[PDB]
Design an enzyme around this catalytic site. Structure first.
Site, PDB file in Angstrom:
ATOM      1  N   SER B  61      23.669  34.595 -23.242  1.00 57.12           N
ATOM      2  CA  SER B  61      22.305  34.485 -22.689  1.00 57.12           C
ATOM      3  C   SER B  61      21.379  35.601 -23.034  1.00 57.12           C
ATOM      4  CB  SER B  61      22.380  34.343 -21.169  1.00 57.12           C
ATOM      5  OG  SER B  61      22.759  33.007 -20.947  1.00 57.12           O
ATOM      6  N   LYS B  64      18.612  34.618 -25.295  1.00 59.61           N
ATOM      7  CA  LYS B  64      17.454  33.875 -24.734  1.00 59.61           C
ATOM      8  C   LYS B  64      16.197  34.737 -24.742  1.00 59.61           C
ATOM      9  CE  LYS B  64      20.228  31.030 -21.534  1.00 59.61           C
ATOM     10  NZ  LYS B  64      20.624  30.889 -20.099  1.00 59.61           N
ATOM     11  N   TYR B 170      21.537  26.275 -31.071  1.00 61.83           N
ATOM     12  CA  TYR B 170      21.717  26.979 -29.782  1.00 61.83           C
ATOM     13  C   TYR B 170      23.057  27.720 -29.693  1.00 61.83           C
ATOM     14  CZ  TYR B 170      21.259  28.132 -24.801  1.00 61.83           C
ATOM     15  OH  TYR B 170      21.153  28.818 -23.593  1.00 61.83           O
ATOM     16  N   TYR B 222      21.449  36.627 -14.411  1.00 63.66           N
ATOM     17  CA  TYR B 222      21.998  35.372 -13.937  1.00 63.66           C
ATOM     18  C   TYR B 222      21.378  34.875 -12.601  1.00 63.66           C
ATOM     19  CZ  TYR B 222      25.656  31.723 -14.024  1.00 63.66           C
ATOM     20  OH  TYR B 222      26.376  30.545 -14.106  1.00 63.66           O
ATOM     21  N   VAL B 240      27.594  36.100 -20.266  1.00 62.36           N
ATOM     22  CA  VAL B 240      28.970  35.916 -19.735  1.00 62.36           C
ATOM     23  C   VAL B 240      30.063  36.416 -20.677  1.00 62.36           C
ATOM     24  CG1 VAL B 240      28.340  33.901 -18.310  1.00 62.36           C
ATOM     25  CG2 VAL B 240      29.245  33.542 -20.681  1.00 62.36           C
TER      26      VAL B 240
END
Lengths: 291, 286, 288, 290
Positions: B61, B64, B170, B222, B240
């Protein structure tokens, strides 16, 4: 860069041109009588001086701004461990900035009756603001209390799930009076300055609240202080601030200044339209963003 | 201080026994919960580091934030926030991030991926950065919930991409891998409002760096961003695989990888470390 | 049931066509005629009366969920079916898309073509017509556009409710929904249900009684998407609808009814078809 | 329906009592005996057969059917379904869920609370053929003291301008409606009126219109057993409405009214002993409408 008063006056005049596009809160009858053309700002700095402009004599109710003060007072009296067992940290327990979470925080204020609990809060507010004469608006409290169906719905919800065990009408009496505490932008800015100095009185350097409590309040003022648009306010202004629907914005620029603004004309999303434009101009020109 | 940092890593490593590596992506379950690395990049363009610093770890993540920066650069603020939200679909949650990824320009997965890699290479100051093919494949083979989200976004006309092509991009984006040193240099670019710390070239506009840091405070950790703001108080983004990218405005970029996660999906070991560092050096922005 | 009385009812209901619109979200369905309406009523003496456009073949769409549930209940048993889906108006029931996908994934066989053939064999026995197949054009149109159903399938896979290849499941599911027949064949299925699973010509059991009862219950609590309560009040019989304009109805111990009327109301059920059934129910006192 | 068989069905159903639990969230209901079970079956010849504990029980949620029928008569169908839904799944979904039920009770006509209650009571007495029916003051009071969720619903409904009444006044009427109490025999008699499409089994005069009796029975199939109406339809197959005091009201169209009370609830809040008894009876007499 000090805050030039004459400069403030110019920002106020520019921001006031937006008043036409906003509308005062009209779901609470007494707030519907506010003037959408009023705008005032004060900035309090750590030299313990203040600069202000616009309609600075007008006393305005805190509304949801009072959720930050009640949180700070509950944290002092109960400590972080207990508070964060009852309400949450996240923008699972209810957030203390949303109405349902704020009512839980208000039900935790210490005292044996509505008036004693309110007095504990008012005494605290008077110390933060450096003004012993602060009270609440009885007309606005009464207008809220007659009309507050959704806050009563949430009190009963909270009772049903055993989160609180207070009498709803007594909790509502306390909450509406807490929301009706009123002051000038000058008083509000000083409260912001205490938060910006991590809990210390700017006059006497007395800790009005623990540093940890000042910090906790500021985190919520960044993550969820502007109603449903904190993320947009972080991008466009970038300082810790708490708004309410009477047109107030309380901000605490860490180590730098407390700012208090009142502009009754709200945008479509319940934040002061005139006040947010003013703070967008000020943040850009003074490089206030913490990001 | 280099020696102090080694001591903080040792202290934070004690917590490894209480966490656990992500196992829902099989390649990630192979990680060692005992590893912890950190680098801190300062505006003098120097870096200090400690722990398992040769280990390359996937961004997950954290990627992102990079993809949002890239699409903000290429499409502008205006078009981006007509597709995704500003509020804690938000571009930090999987559904918003897949929208952001679908906006990356290029005529094929390869070209769109290279735009993102070329941008990462510039931010990191390391042209050798690529992705883990092993991790990308493990992700792609079992990403049912993200494929559910892609069809959801198609159904509602939010994207009109081929789902398999979008998932290829992705998963590869999430599999971009680097050491804690590269990751801290990215944090440093952000901390310096988009500026290259060697050449002063703007690697991204000031408005874009600011926007990234705001999401990093409101929803970067998160589901525990509010607690992290209280306990540490810096713009950070986690994943993660155990990474935490942090950008302390005007002060340093920080890159941590500690695969042992807490029950809320953030590096347990790396959290503890950032709590010590933040106390020791007064890093909180609040 | 008088034929000529049926023709007059159908022409009365056709007056409503202008107020409806065909489903165009599955492109091949947007090609249907909003003015068409056909009904057949099948009775226990194994006779049928029909009226309107009775030679048009129309896809089942969601009506096929009842057929699939019957098959699966026979093949896997009640206990296993209701461990995977619920019974209430883990998917809530077999009538909503998520439960229907789970039901369809339970059809046995080694191939999609074999799973499908088992479905078609069963529908051909129910309908008393061995020529029933699916519309390839409608199955393809659904398969190319079915984004929400694929989303559901990947969610079911995530939570380990299904473990089938999603493209294979959706190939089977789109073919199931594209099974096509006239109102006469559909009415015969309704009559098999109304007779508690018995074949009306030869009186032997095409499904167990307990299975026919189960389908008929879902046909009251949730058979008209979004409007089963309204239908129970205005018509009052077990019925299932689909977006191609079909209504399958099974009036316990009395008759089977199939209607196709492609012009749908805002809630996704045949507007012309429900008006016709409202008139029929009033005239013959069909309400349960 | 023969009486001695009924007695054996009751003995059979009672063995499940140990696996159930009385409703103890309205403290007064906590005082009920989980071993009680009573049943009455009323047939169109205006005769009744019963077995088990004939003893008075509050209707609770069963009253929502009675309120709906009263308001439908009084305000008409197209005001009622302007205000509440007709569907199983800010306008409330249907009149059987608590929020829709409060809207229903708010539409009962009269100046005073006691006037509104008196109209409801008069109606229930007609339906049941028993002018001695009143409500339990102890249960009404225990409800009124602890009804936090229903007050939360009332304020939400007021905020969205669905209702206008004072919340405490509406609550007074509602808790008293729910405290209306009667034996399984009175209840079965109500169920028979519904089953005979609104006709009085003794006189044959309409007690409610046929259209209103039919609307009631439709909600009793789609959402009458709270969260287990689909299960009930499969295992029993008749229009029934339950309440947390252990009641089940059933109307089998053209055939009989059934009233059951068994205070021991399953985990969905329907009578456990009651539902087992009704499964046995449906099987024996082929009661299912499906």
């Amino acid at each position: 860069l000090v805050y030039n008063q004459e400069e403030l006056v110019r920002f106020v005049e520019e921001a006031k041109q937006y008043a036409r596009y906003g509308k005062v809160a009209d779901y609470i009858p007494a707030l519907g009588k506010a003037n959408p053309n009023e705008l005032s700002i004060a900035i309090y700095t750590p030299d313990d001086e203040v600069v202000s402009a616009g309609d600075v004599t007008v006393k305005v109710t805190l509304q949801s701004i009072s959720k930050i003060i009640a949180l700070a007072l509950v944290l002092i009296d109960r400590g972080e461990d207990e508070v964060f067992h009852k309400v949450g940290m996240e923008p699972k327990p209810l957030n203390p900035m949303i109405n349902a979470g704020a009512l839980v925080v208000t039900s935790m204020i210490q005292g044996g009756s509505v008036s004693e609990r309110l007095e504990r809060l008012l005494a605290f507010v008077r110390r933060l603001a450096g003004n012993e004469r602060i009270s609440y608006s009885d007309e606005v409290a009464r207008s809220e209390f007659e009309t507050a169906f959704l806050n009563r719905s949430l009190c009963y919800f909270l009772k049903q799930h055993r989160i609180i065990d207070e009498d709803v009408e007594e909790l509502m009496e306390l909450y509406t009076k807490q929301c009706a505490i009123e002051m000038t932008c000058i008083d509000l800015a000083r409260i912001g300055l205490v938060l910006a100095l991590d809990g210390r009185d700017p006059h006497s350097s007395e800790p009005l609240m623990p540093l940890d409590v000042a910090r906790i309040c500021k985190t919520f003022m960044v993550t969820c202080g502007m109603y449903n648009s904190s993320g947009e306010f972080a991008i466009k202004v970038g300082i810790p601030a708490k708004s309410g629907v009477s047109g107030g914005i309380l901000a605490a620029v860490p180590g730098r200044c407390g700012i208090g603004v009142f502009g009754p004309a709200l945008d479509d999303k319940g934040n002061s339209l005139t006040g947010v434009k003013l703070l967008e101009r000020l943040s850009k020109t003074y490089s206030l963003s913490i990001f």
